mmCIF file with all atom_site columns, C-alpha atoms in Angstrom:
data_model
loop_
_atom_site.group_PDB
_atom_site.id
_atom_site.type_symbol
_atom_site.label_atom_id
_atom_site.label_alt_id
_atom_site.label_comp_id
_atom_site.label_asym_id
_atom_site.label_entity_id
_atom_site.label_seq_id
_atom_site.pdbx_PDB_ins_code
_atom_site.Cartn_x
_atom_site.Cartn_y
_atom_site.Cartn_z
_atom_site.occupancy
_atom_site.B_iso_or_equiv
_atom_site.pdbx_formal_charge
_atom_site.auth_seq_id
_atom_site.auth_comp_id
_atom_site.auth_asym_id
_atom_site.auth_atom_id
_atom_site.pdbx_PDB_model_num
ATOM 1   C CA . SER A 1 1  ? -20.374 27.073  16.006  1.00 13.74 ? 1  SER A CA 1
ATOM 2   C CA . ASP A 1 2  ? -22.964 26.866  13.234  1.00 10.99 ? 2  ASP A CA 1
ATOM 3   C CA . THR A 1 3  ? -24.332 23.406  12.479  1.00 12.90 ? 3  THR A CA 1
ATOM 4   C CA . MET A 1 4  ? -24.486 23.604  8.676   1.00 11.86 ? 4  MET A CA 1
ATOM 5   C CA . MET A 1 5  ? -20.946 24.999  8.701   1.00 10.21 ? 5  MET A CA 1
ATOM 6   C CA . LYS A 1 6  ? -19.854 21.926  10.674  1.00 9.32  ? 6  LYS A CA 1
ATOM 7   C CA . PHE A 1 7  ? -21.267 19.492  8.104   1.00 9.49  ? 7  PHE A CA 1
ATOM 8   C CA . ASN A 1 8  ? -19.571 21.247  5.183   1.00 12.02 ? 8  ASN A CA 1
ATOM 9   C CA . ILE A 1 9  ? -16.266 21.300  7.082   1.00 12.06 ? 9  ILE A CA 1
ATOM 10  C CA . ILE A 1 10 ? -16.490 17.521  7.476   1.00 11.41 ? 10 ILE A CA 1
ATOM 11  C CA . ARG A 1 11 ? -17.561 17.066  3.847   1.00 11.05 ? 11 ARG A CA 1
ATOM 12  C CA . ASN A 1 12 ? -14.625 19.135  2.587   1.00 11.26 ? 12 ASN A CA 1
ATOM 13  C CA . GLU A 1 13 ? -11.976 17.300  4.615   1.00 10.16 ? 13 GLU A CA 1
ATOM 14  C CA . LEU A 1 14 ? -13.593 13.946  3.809   1.00 11.29 ? 14 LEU A CA 1
ATOM 15  C CA . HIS A 1 15 ? -13.413 14.993  0.154   1.00 14.05 ? 15 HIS A CA 1
ATOM 16  C CA . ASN A 1 16 ? -9.692  15.683  0.535   1.00 11.04 ? 16 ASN A CA 1
ATOM 17  C CA . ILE A 1 17 ? -9.106  12.233  2.050   1.00 10.73 ? 17 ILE A CA 1
ATOM 18  C CA . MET A 1 18 ? -10.879 10.376  -0.763  1.00 10.22 ? 18 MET A CA 1
ATOM 19  C CA . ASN A 1 19 ? -9.547  12.547  -3.594  1.00 14.27 ? 19 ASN A CA 1
ATOM 20  C CA . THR A 1 20 ? -5.900  12.513  -2.481  1.00 9.77  ? 20 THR A CA 1
ATOM 21  C CA . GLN A 1 21 ? -4.680  9.812   -0.099  1.00 11.81 ? 21 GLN A CA 1
ATOM 22  C CA . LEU A 1 22 ? -7.400  7.212   -0.689  1.00 12.36 ? 22 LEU A CA 1
ATOM 23  C CA . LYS A 1 23 ? -7.347  7.658   -4.472  1.00 13.91 ? 23 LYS A CA 1
ATOM 24  C CA . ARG A 1 24 ? -3.552  7.395   -4.625  1.00 12.01 ? 24 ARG A CA 1
ATOM 25  C CA . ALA A 1 25 ? -3.571  4.407   -2.267  1.00 12.42 ? 25 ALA A CA 1
ATOM 26  C CA . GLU A 1 26 ? -5.774  2.350   -4.597  1.00 12.64 ? 26 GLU A CA 1
ATOM 27  C CA . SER A 1 27 ? -3.566  2.698   -7.681  1.00 16.52 ? 27 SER A CA 1
ATOM 28  C CA . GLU A 1 28 ? -0.424  2.223   -5.570  1.00 13.41 ? 28 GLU A CA 1
ATOM 29  C CA . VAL A 1 29 ? -1.570  -1.111  -4.109  1.00 13.87 ? 29 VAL A CA 1
ATOM 30  C CA . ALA A 1 30 ? -2.416  -2.199  -7.657  1.00 11.59 ? 30 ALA A CA 1
ATOM 31  C CA . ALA A 1 31 ? 1.073   -1.273  -8.867  1.00 8.97  ? 31 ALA A CA 1
ATOM 32  C CA . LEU A 1 32 ? 2.762   -2.753  -5.789  1.00 7.07  ? 32 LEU A CA 1
ATOM 33  C CA . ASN A 1 33 ? 0.932   -6.061  -6.243  1.00 9.09  ? 33 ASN A CA 1
ATOM 34  C CA . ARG A 1 34 ? 1.914   -6.227  -9.915  1.00 7.41  ? 34 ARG A CA 1
ATOM 35  C CA . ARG A 1 35 ? 5.528   -5.230  -9.219  1.00 3.16  ? 35 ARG A CA 1
ATOM 36  C CA . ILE A 1 36 ? 5.888   -7.880  -6.503  1.00 4.38  ? 36 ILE A CA 1
ATOM 37  C CA . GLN A 1 37 ? 4.653   -10.578 -8.888  1.00 4.36  ? 37 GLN A CA 1
ATOM 38  C CA . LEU A 1 38 ? 6.913   -9.363  -11.706 1.00 2.71  ? 38 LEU A CA 1
ATOM 39  C CA . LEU A 1 39 ? 9.921   -9.412  -9.371  1.00 2.00  ? 39 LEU A CA 1
ATOM 40  C CA . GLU A 1 40 ? 9.107   -12.988 -8.347  1.00 2.00  ? 40 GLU A CA 1
ATOM 41  C CA . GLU A 1 41 ? 8.798   -14.014 -12.001 1.00 6.60  ? 41 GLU A CA 1
ATOM 42  C CA . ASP A 1 42 ? 12.218  -12.455 -12.590 1.00 7.02  ? 42 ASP A CA 1
ATOM 43  C CA . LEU A 1 43 ? 13.565  -14.387 -9.604  1.00 6.21  ? 43 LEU A CA 1
ATOM 44  C CA . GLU A 1 44 ? 11.982  -17.569 -10.986 1.00 11.61 ? 44 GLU A CA 1
ATOM 45  C CA . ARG A 1 45 ? 13.600  -16.974 -14.361 1.00 7.59  ? 45 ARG A CA 1
ATOM 46  C CA . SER A 1 46 ? 16.822  -16.196 -12.484 1.00 8.83  ? 46 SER A CA 1
ATOM 47  C CA . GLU A 1 47 ? 16.971  -19.504 -10.585 1.00 8.14  ? 47 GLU A CA 1
ATOM 48  C CA . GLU A 1 48 ? 16.943  -21.599 -13.772 1.00 8.28  ? 48 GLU A CA 1
ATOM 49  C CA . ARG A 1 49 ? 19.980  -19.690 -15.045 1.00 6.92  ? 49 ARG A CA 1
ATOM 50  C CA . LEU A 1 50 ? 21.786  -19.931 -11.699 1.00 10.03 ? 50 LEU A CA 1
ATOM 51  C CA . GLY A 1 51 ? 21.030  -23.653 -11.644 1.00 11.23 ? 51 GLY A CA 1
ATOM 52  C CA . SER A 1 52 ? 22.552  -24.107 -15.100 1.00 11.40 ? 52 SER A CA 1
ATOM 53  C CA . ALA A 1 53 ? 25.600  -21.959 -14.329 1.00 12.49 ? 53 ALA A CA 1
ATOM 54  C CA . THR A 1 54 ? 26.099  -23.970 -11.131 1.00 13.08 ? 54 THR A CA 1
ATOM 55  C CA . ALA A 1 55 ? 26.181  -27.196 -13.152 1.00 13.51 ? 55 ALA A CA 1
ATOM 56  C CA . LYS A 1 56 ? 28.473  -25.647 -15.772 1.00 16.85 ? 56 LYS A CA 1
ATOM 57  C CA . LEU A 1 57 ? 31.035  -24.489 -13.201 1.00 17.70 ? 57 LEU A CA 1
ATOM 58  C CA . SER A 1 58 ? 31.161  -27.887 -11.480 1.00 19.08 ? 58 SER A CA 1
ATOM 59  C CA . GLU A 1 59 ? 31.688  -29.664 -14.806 1.00 20.18 ? 59 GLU A CA 1
ATOM 60  C CA . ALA A 1 60 ? 34.534  -27.239 -15.521 1.00 17.78 ? 60 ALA A CA 1
ATOM 61  C CA . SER A 1 61 ? 35.999  -27.890 -12.063 1.00 13.62 ? 61 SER A CA 1
ATOM 62  C CA . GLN A 1 62 ? 36.086  -31.635 -12.745 1.00 15.63 ? 62 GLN A CA 1
ATOM 63  C CA . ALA A 1 63 ? 37.444  -31.027 -16.258 1.00 16.50 ? 63 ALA A CA 1
ATOM 64  C CA . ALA A 1 64 ? 40.226  -28.796 -14.909 1.00 16.59 ? 64 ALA A CA 1
ATOM 65  C CA . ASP A 1 65 ? 41.625  -31.807 -13.026 1.00 16.43 ? 65 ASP A CA 1
ATOM 66  C CA . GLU A 1 66 ? 41.629  -34.211 -15.987 1.00 18.96 ? 66 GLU A CA 1
ATOM 67  C CA . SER A 1 67 ? 43.498  -31.883 -18.368 1.00 20.73 ? 67 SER A CA 1
ATOM 68  C CA . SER B 2 1  ? 35.110  -17.298 -21.579 1.00 21.81 ? 1  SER B CA 1
ATOM 69  C CA . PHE B 2 2  ? 31.371  -17.653 -22.147 1.00 21.82 ? 2  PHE B CA 1
ATOM 70  C CA . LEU B 2 3  ? 30.605  -18.709 -18.564 1.00 27.67 ? 3  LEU B CA 1
ATOM 71  C CA . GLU B 2 4  ? 32.267  -15.596 -17.138 1.00 27.09 ? 4  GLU B CA 1
ATOM 72  C CA . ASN B 2 5  ? 30.233  -13.387 -19.466 1.00 27.90 ? 5  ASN B CA 1
ATOM 73  C CA . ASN B 2 6  ? 27.210  -15.414 -18.339 1.00 26.19 ? 6  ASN B CA 1
ATOM 74  C CA . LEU B 2 7  ? 27.944  -14.837 -14.649 1.00 28.69 ? 7  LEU B CA 1
ATOM 75  C CA . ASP B 2 8  ? 28.670  -11.160 -15.313 1.00 29.12 ? 8  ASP B CA 1
ATOM 76  C CA . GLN B 2 9  ? 25.290  -10.861 -17.037 1.00 29.10 ? 9  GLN B CA 1
ATOM 77  C CA . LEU B 2 10 ? 23.602  -12.676 -14.143 1.00 30.98 ? 10 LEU B CA 1
ATOM 78  C CA . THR B 2 11 ? 25.370  -10.313 -11.735 1.00 31.62 ? 11 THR B CA 1
ATOM 79  C CA . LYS B 2 12 ? 23.875  -7.387  -13.656 1.00 32.37 ? 12 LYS B CA 1
ATOM 80  C CA . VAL B 2 13 ? 20.365  -8.851  -13.456 1.00 34.09 ? 13 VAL B CA 1
ATOM 81  C CA . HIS B 2 14 ? 20.702  -9.331  -9.697  1.00 35.52 ? 14 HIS B CA 1
ATOM 82  C CA . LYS B 2 15 ? 21.853  -5.726  -9.281  1.00 37.40 ? 15 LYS B CA 1
ATOM 83  C CA . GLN B 2 16 ? 18.577  -4.627  -10.878 1.00 38.14 ? 16 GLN B CA 1
ATOM 84  C CA . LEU B 2 17 ? 16.547  -7.062  -8.764  1.00 36.18 ? 17 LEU B CA 1
ATOM 85  C CA . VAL B 2 18 ? 18.261  -5.822  -5.591  1.00 34.99 ? 18 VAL B CA 1
ATOM 86  C CA . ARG B 2 19 ? 17.194  -2.268  -6.430  1.00 37.49 ? 19 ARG B CA 1
ATOM 87  C CA . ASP B 2 20 ? 13.691  -3.422  -7.370  1.00 38.22 ? 20 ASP B CA 1
ATOM 88  C CA . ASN B 2 21 ? 13.436  -5.361  -4.106  1.00 33.01 ? 21 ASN B CA 1
ATOM 89  C CA . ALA B 2 22 ? 14.798  -2.433  -2.081  1.00 29.77 ? 22 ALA B CA 1
ATOM 90  C CA . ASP B 2 23 ? 12.148  -0.136  -3.565  1.00 28.42 ? 23 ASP B CA 1
ATOM 91  C CA . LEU B 2 24 ? 9.305   -2.527  -2.708  1.00 28.37 ? 24 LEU B CA 1
ATOM 92  C CA . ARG B 2 25 ? 10.585  -3.080  0.836   1.00 27.95 ? 25 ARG B CA 1
ATOM 93  C CA . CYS B 2 26 ? 10.430  0.719   1.252   1.00 30.36 ? 26 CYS B CA 1
ATOM 94  C CA . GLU B 2 27 ? 6.996   1.447   -0.245  1.00 28.85 ? 27 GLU B CA 1
ATOM 95  C CA . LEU B 2 28 ? 4.991   -1.235  1.586   1.00 29.31 ? 28 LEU B CA 1
ATOM 96  C CA . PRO B 2 29 ? 5.699   -0.056  5.171   1.00 28.25 ? 29 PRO B CA 1
ATOM 97  C CA . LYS B 2 30 ? 5.314   3.540   3.978   1.00 29.78 ? 30 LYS B CA 1
ATOM 98  C CA . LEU B 2 31 ? 1.868   2.752   2.577   1.00 31.04 ? 31 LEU B CA 1
ATOM 99  C CA . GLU B 2 32 ? 0.775   1.159   5.854   1.00 31.86 ? 32 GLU B CA 1
ATOM 100 C CA . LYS B 2 33 ? 1.894   4.315   7.661   1.00 32.27 ? 33 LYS B CA 1
ATOM 101 C CA . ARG B 2 34 ? -0.016  6.466   5.165   1.00 28.30 ? 34 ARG B CA 1
ATOM 102 C CA . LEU B 2 35 ? -3.109  4.285   5.600   1.00 28.23 ? 35 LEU B CA 1
ATOM 103 C CA . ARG B 2 36 ? -2.743  4.535   9.384   1.00 26.94 ? 36 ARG B CA 1
ATOM 104 C CA . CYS B 2 37 ? -2.537  8.327   9.177   1.00 22.55 ? 37 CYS B CA 1
ATOM 105 C CA . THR B 2 38 ? -5.690  8.352   7.045   1.00 21.35 ? 38 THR B CA 1
ATOM 106 C CA . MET B 2 39 ? -7.644  6.323   9.604   1.00 20.66 ? 39 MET B CA 1
ATOM 107 C CA . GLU B 2 40 ? -6.635  8.787   12.323  1.00 18.78 ? 40 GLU B CA 1
ATOM 108 C CA . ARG B 2 41 ? -8.081  11.599  10.210  1.00 18.27 ? 41 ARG B CA 1
ATOM 109 C CA . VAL B 2 42 ? -11.266 9.578   9.658   1.00 15.10 ? 42 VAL B CA 1
ATOM 110 C CA . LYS B 2 43 ? -11.625 8.890   13.385  1.00 16.63 ? 43 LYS B CA 1
ATOM 111 C CA . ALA B 2 44 ? -11.347 12.623  14.077  1.00 19.12 ? 44 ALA B CA 1
ATOM 112 C CA . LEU B 2 45 ? -13.947 13.215  11.359  1.00 20.59 ? 45 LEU B CA 1
ATOM 113 C CA . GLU B 2 46 ? -16.261 10.639  12.948  1.00 19.79 ? 46 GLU B CA 1
ATOM 114 C CA . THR B 2 47 ? -16.164 12.379  16.330  1.00 21.19 ? 47 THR B CA 1
ATOM 115 C CA . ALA B 2 48 ? -16.590 15.740  14.593  1.00 22.71 ? 48 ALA B CA 1
ATOM 116 C CA . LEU B 2 49 ? -19.741 14.362  12.957  1.00 29.09 ? 49 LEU B CA 1
ATOM 117 C CA . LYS B 2 50 ? -21.205 13.276  16.297  1.00 29.23 ? 50 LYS B CA 1
ATOM 118 C CA . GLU B 2 51 ? -20.476 16.734  17.702  1.00 31.12 ? 51 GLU B CA 1
ATOM 119 C CA . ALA B 2 52 ? -22.287 18.203  14.689  1.00 30.29 ? 52 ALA B CA 1
ATOM 120 C CA . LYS B 2 53 ? -25.179 15.748  15.032  1.00 30.05 ? 53 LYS B CA 1
ATOM 121 C CA . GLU B 2 54 ? -25.779 16.729  18.653  1.00 30.87 ? 54 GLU B CA 1
ATOM 122 C CA . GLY B 2 55 ? -25.531 20.357  17.574  1.00 29.13 ? 55 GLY B CA 1
ATOM 123 C CA . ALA B 2 56 ? -28.170 19.773  14.891  1.00 29.07 ? 56 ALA B CA 1
ATOM 124 C CA . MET B 2 57 ? -30.906 18.547  17.248  1.00 28.66 ? 57 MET B CA 1
ATOM 125 C CA . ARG B 2 58 ? -29.980 21.128  19.853  1.00 30.52 ? 58 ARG B CA 1
ATOM 126 C CA . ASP B 2 59 ? -31.168 23.345  16.989  1.00 31.62 ? 59 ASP B CA 1
ATOM 127 C CA . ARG B 2 60 ? -34.176 21.108  16.269  1.00 30.19 ? 60 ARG B CA 1
ATOM 128 C CA . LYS B 2 61 ? -35.461 21.469  19.828  1.00 28.31 ? 61 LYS B CA 1
ATOM 129 C CA . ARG B 2 62 ? -34.738 25.192  19.422  1.00 26.58 ? 62 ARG B CA 1
ATOM 130 C CA . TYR B 2 63 ? -36.831 25.545  16.258  1.00 30.14 ? 63 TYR B CA 1
ATOM 131 C CA . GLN B 2 64 ? -39.710 23.725  17.958  1.00 29.85 ? 64 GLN B CA 1
ATOM 132 C CA . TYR B 2 65 ? -39.384 26.227  20.825  1.00 26.41 ? 65 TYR B CA 1
ATOM 133 C CA . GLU B 2 66 ? -39.370 29.247  18.514  1.00 26.70 ? 66 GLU B CA 1
ATOM 134 C CA . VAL B 2 67 ? -42.621 27.861  17.046  1.00 26.22 ? 67 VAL B CA 1
ATOM 135 C CA . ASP B 2 68 ? -44.417 27.052  20.302  1.00 25.64 ? 68 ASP B CA 1
ATOM 136 C CA . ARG B 2 69 ? -44.138 30.745  21.241  1.00 26.04 ? 69 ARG B CA 1
ATOM 137 C CA . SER C 3 1  ? 38.506  -19.089 -8.285  1.00 24.24 ? 1  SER C CA 1
ATOM 138 C CA . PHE C 3 2  ? 36.693  -15.796 -8.886  1.00 24.33 ? 2  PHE C CA 1
ATOM 139 C CA . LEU C 3 3  ? 34.094  -17.644 -10.950 1.00 22.11 ? 3  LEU C CA 1
ATOM 140 C CA . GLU C 3 4  ? 33.139  -19.518 -7.779  1.00 24.41 ? 4  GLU C CA 1
ATOM 141 C CA . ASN C 3 5  ? 33.060  -16.405 -5.594  1.00 23.30 ? 5  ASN C CA 1
ATOM 142 C CA . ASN C 3 6  ? 30.898  -14.689 -8.213  1.00 23.47 ? 6  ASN C CA 1
ATOM 143 C CA . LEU C 3 7  ? 28.514  -17.646 -8.446  1.00 23.11 ? 7  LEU C CA 1
ATOM 144 C CA . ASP C 3 8  ? 28.489  -18.141 -4.667  1.00 25.37 ? 8  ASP C CA 1
ATOM 145 C CA . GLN C 3 9  ? 27.570  -14.478 -4.208  1.00 24.55 ? 9  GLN C CA 1
ATOM 146 C CA . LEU C 3 10 ? 24.846  -14.737 -6.853  1.00 25.41 ? 10 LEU C CA 1
ATOM 147 C CA . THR C 3 11 ? 23.511  -17.795 -5.016  1.00 23.45 ? 11 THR C CA 1
ATOM 148 C CA . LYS C 3 12 ? 23.522  -15.897 -1.712  1.00 23.50 ? 12 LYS C CA 1
ATOM 149 C CA . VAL C 3 13 ? 21.817  -12.756 -3.031  1.00 23.40 ? 13 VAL C CA 1
ATOM 150 C CA . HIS C 3 14 ? 19.215  -14.771 -4.944  1.00 27.05 ? 14 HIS C CA 1
ATOM 151 C CA . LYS C 3 15 ? 18.176  -16.700 -1.828  1.00 29.25 ? 15 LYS C CA 1
ATOM 152 C CA . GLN C 3 16 ? 17.883  -13.379 0.019   1.00 30.30 ? 16 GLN C CA 1
ATOM 153 C CA . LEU C 3 17 ? 15.643  -11.934 -2.700  1.00 26.92 ? 17 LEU C CA 1
ATOM 154 C CA . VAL C 3 18 ? 13.455  -15.060 -2.700  1.00 31.51 ? 18 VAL C CA 1
ATOM 155 C CA . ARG C 3 19 ? 12.897  -14.799 1.056   1.00 29.04 ? 19 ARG C CA 1
ATOM 156 C CA . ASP C 3 20 ? 12.256  -11.056 0.773   1.00 28.65 ? 20 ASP C CA 1
ATOM 157 C CA . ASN C 3 21 ? 9.663   -11.729 -1.938  1.00 28.32 ? 21 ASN C CA 1
ATOM 158 C CA . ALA C 3 22 ? 7.867   -14.196 0.336   1.00 30.08 ? 22 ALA C CA 1
ATOM 159 C CA . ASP C 3 23 ? 7.682   -11.441 2.954   1.00 30.41 ? 23 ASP C CA 1
ATOM 160 C CA . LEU C 3 24 ? 6.378   -8.965  0.373   1.00 28.70 ? 24 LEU C CA 1
ATOM 161 C CA . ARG C 3 25 ? 3.743   -11.420 -0.872  1.00 26.76 ? 25 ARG C CA 1
ATOM 162 C CA . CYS C 3 26 ? 2.431   -11.961 2.676   1.00 25.84 ? 26 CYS C CA 1
ATOM 163 C CA . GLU C 3 27 ? 2.460   -8.370  3.961   1.00 27.13 ? 27 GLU C CA 1
ATOM 164 C CA . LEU C 3 28 ? 0.759   -7.055  0.800   1.00 26.17 ? 28 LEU C CA 1
ATOM 165 C CA . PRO C 3 29 ? -2.676  -8.700  1.341   1.00 24.97 ? 29 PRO C CA 1
ATOM 166 C CA . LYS C 3 30 ? -2.677  -7.257  4.865   1.00 26.66 ? 30 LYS C CA 1
ATOM 167 C CA . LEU C 3 31 ? -2.220  -3.871  3.198   1.00 24.05 ? 31 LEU C CA 1
ATOM 168 C CA . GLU C 3 32 ? -5.101  -4.577  0.808   1.00 24.01 ? 32 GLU C CA 1
ATOM 169 C CA . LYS C 3 33 ? -7.353  -5.483  3.741   1.00 23.79 ? 33 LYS C CA 1
ATOM 170 C CA . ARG C 3 34 ? -6.309  -2.315  5.579   1.00 26.96 ? 34 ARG C CA 1
ATOM 171 C CA . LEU C 3 35 ? -7.008  -0.235  2.471   1.00 26.65 ? 35 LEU C CA 1
ATOM 172 C CA . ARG C 3 36 ? -10.372 -1.951  2.020   1.00 27.06 ? 36 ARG C CA 1
ATOM 173 C CA . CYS C 3 37 ? -11.384 -1.388  5.648   1.00 26.76 ? 37 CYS C CA 1
ATOM 174 C CA . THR C 3 38 ? -10.331 2.268   5.509   1.00 25.71 ? 38 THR C CA 1
ATOM 175 C CA . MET C 3 39 ? -12.485 3.058   2.469   1.00 24.93 ? 39 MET C CA 1
ATOM 176 C CA . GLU C 3 40 ? -15.363 1.099   3.999   1.00 25.70 ? 40 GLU C CA 1
ATOM 177 C CA . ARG C 3 41 ? -15.175 3.354   7.056   1.00 23.99 ? 41 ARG C CA 1
ATOM 178 C CA . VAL C 3 42 ? -14.964 6.466   4.867   1.00 25.31 ? 42 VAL C CA 1
ATOM 179 C CA . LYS C 3 43 ? -18.059 5.522   2.853   1.00 24.49 ? 43 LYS C CA 1
ATOM 180 C CA . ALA C 3 44 ? -19.994 4.733   6.039   1.00 24.83 ? 44 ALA C CA 1
ATOM 181 C CA . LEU C 3 45 ? -19.001 8.150   7.393   1.00 27.01 ? 45 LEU C CA 1
ATOM 182 C CA . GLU C 3 46 ? -19.999 9.780   4.111   1.00 26.47 ? 46 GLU C CA 1
ATOM 183 C CA . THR C 3 47 ? -23.545 8.381   3.976   1.00 24.56 ? 47 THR C CA 1
ATOM 184 C CA . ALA C 3 48 ? -23.965 9.188   7.672   1.00 25.78 ? 48 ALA C CA 1
ATOM 185 C CA . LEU C 3 49 ? -22.945 12.752  6.819   1.00 26.00 ? 49 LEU C CA 1
ATOM 186 C CA . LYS C 3 50 ? -25.670 13.155  4.158   1.00 27.10 ? 50 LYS C CA 1
ATOM 187 C CA . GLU C 3 51 ? -28.255 11.693  6.486   1.00 24.17 ? 51 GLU C CA 1
ATOM 188 C CA . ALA C 3 52 ? -27.267 14.295  9.062   1.00 27.14 ? 52 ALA C CA 1
ATOM 189 C CA . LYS C 3 53 ? -26.877 17.175  6.589   1.00 25.61 ? 53 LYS C CA 1
ATOM 190 C CA . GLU C 3 54 ? -30.167 16.614  4.759   1.00 25.94 ? 54 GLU C CA 1
ATOM 191 C CA . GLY C 3 55 ? -31.822 15.675  8.050   1.00 27.43 ? 55 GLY C CA 1
ATOM 192 C CA . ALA C 3 56 ? -30.691 19.034  9.407   1.00 29.94 ? 56 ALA C CA 1
ATOM 193 C CA . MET C 3 57 ? -32.057 20.753  6.299   1.00 27.47 ? 57 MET C CA 1
ATOM 194 C CA . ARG C 3 58 ? -35.365 18.916  6.656   1.00 28.18 ? 58 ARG C CA 1
ATOM 195 C CA . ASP C 3 59 ? -35.703 20.415  10.153  1.00 27.85 ? 59 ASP C CA 1
ATOM 196 C CA . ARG C 3 60 ? -34.976 23.984  9.031   1.00 27.70 ? 60 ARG C CA 1
ATOM 197 C CA . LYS C 3 61 ? -37.873 23.489  6.584   1.00 29.04 ? 61 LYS C CA 1
ATOM 198 C CA . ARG C 3 62 ? -40.248 23.757  9.567   1.00 27.71 ? 62 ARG C CA 1
#
């Protein structure tokens, strides 16, 4: 086929890759990274509560025997 | 009892974290697959460029032959 | 004692989420590197395309 037609075909499809999948991929990895860290922070706030509830239940288990 | 309301609230937080974790465990492999499908399209584009490059100088030796005559 | 089954389940799910997060935090940089290497290959293809397109239009100028 024609040579200059071949270059513009490649340019157009390459434009579609950058403007759609590659563009979306950049902002998704940014969101995914931030969401993973926020989840871990939530887990780290969660452990302190679970650690305190674990101590509170054991104290109640020992206090249920003395009553 | 306060402790049972506490555990019921903690249960609720974990239900949200389970759904947040399930979403992330679904998007990360999907994004790798989408990135892999992009690189296949780029590889096809790279071979299509080399086919166009050879076609361009097949035309450059043609223009030099339309001039030498 | 219901309170203990609830807390024991919360303990079990929380450990599972912590280990899942460690997997997510390790697989994610591999995804960043793959995204970075894909766009590097696209840009290299793109500048090679202009060199070929304008180089083809320099030769039609003869």
